[PDB]
Design an enzyme around this catalytic site. Sequence first.
Site, PDB file in Angstrom:
ATOM      1  N   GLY A 116       4.045 -13.086  -7.771  1.00 18.23           N
ATOM      2  CA  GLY A 116       4.427 -13.515  -6.439  1.00 18.23           C
ATOM      3  C   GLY A 116       3.331 -14.276  -5.717  1.00 18.23           C
ATOM      4  CB  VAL A 137       3.705 -13.804  -0.896  1.00 21.03           C
ATOM      5  CG1 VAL A 137       4.107 -14.338   0.466  1.00 21.03           C
ATOM      6  CG2 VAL A 137       4.552 -14.433  -1.989  1.00 21.03           C
ATOM      7  CE  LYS A 189       6.403 -19.205  -2.222  1.00 22.45           C
ATOM      8  NZ  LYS A 189       7.691 -18.515  -1.909  1.00 22.45           N
ATOM      9  CG  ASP A 227      16.193 -19.903  -8.724  1.00 23.44           C
ATOM     10  OD1 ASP A 227      17.035 -19.334  -9.455  1.00 23.44           O
ATOM     11  OD2 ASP A 227      14.982 -19.564  -8.685  1.00 23.44           O
TER      12      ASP A 227
END
Length: 275
Positions: free
Chosen positions: A26, A28, A41, A133
Amino acid sequence: DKSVEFSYDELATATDNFSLANKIGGSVYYAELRGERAAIKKMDMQASKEFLAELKVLTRVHHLNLVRLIGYSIEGSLFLVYEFIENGNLSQHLRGSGRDPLPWATRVQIALDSARGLEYIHEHTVPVYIHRDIKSANILIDKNYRGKVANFGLTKLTEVGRLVGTFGYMPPEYAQYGDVSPKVDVYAFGVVLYELISAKDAIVSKGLVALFEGVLSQPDPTEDLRKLVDQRLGDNYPVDSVRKMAQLAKACTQDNPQLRPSMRSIVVALMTLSS
């Protein structure tokens, strides 16, 4: 512009040089930037291609049901800064531990919220987008359990053999031919609707779409449909609303993309089987 461009120092100071304490996912990081709760991010890349200007246009998208791109940083590595959504994602609410089950009425509102966001990027943004997505992990939930669609317009980062998508959400015409259209998003949204009904993963050995197809193919699917409904809901759901949602998801996941409904028609239907 610097109203949307962040220096690395501003982000490092706000994250205590990206302390592990401020990680939320991830790669983040949470931060408070210019009076706004944000999610930063790190993208392991960088590009002064049109993506910089494509990032500019992305920052102008403003919708209650889309996660807003607050800004970015071009000091080296690409940093994308997003508004922070505080109550996780839909996948965690449906299957993750620690959380109470979503009431049926709240699931309908989340479906409506997500569809409105998709309707906006399909029909109303300049330019229009195809998300490509859509999935339950890309639907983020706020403290009032309203839904926001995340991570749209981020396709060039992946493509630029390869494929964009997530297993369990790709329609047959894309998997087999590479065909891209807005109906790719419609199909994936159908899978999310099945997840809302069943709380099963898009995968499981078996796909959700085929499981519901066999159930809905019966003259009276009601008894088999009840087995597929999330057991954490118990008997606390209107049977006709679940039937309407299931039939809508079935229409959304048909083999023929031309026969899947548009997001505008999906919104109209969800407002009928509302809550």
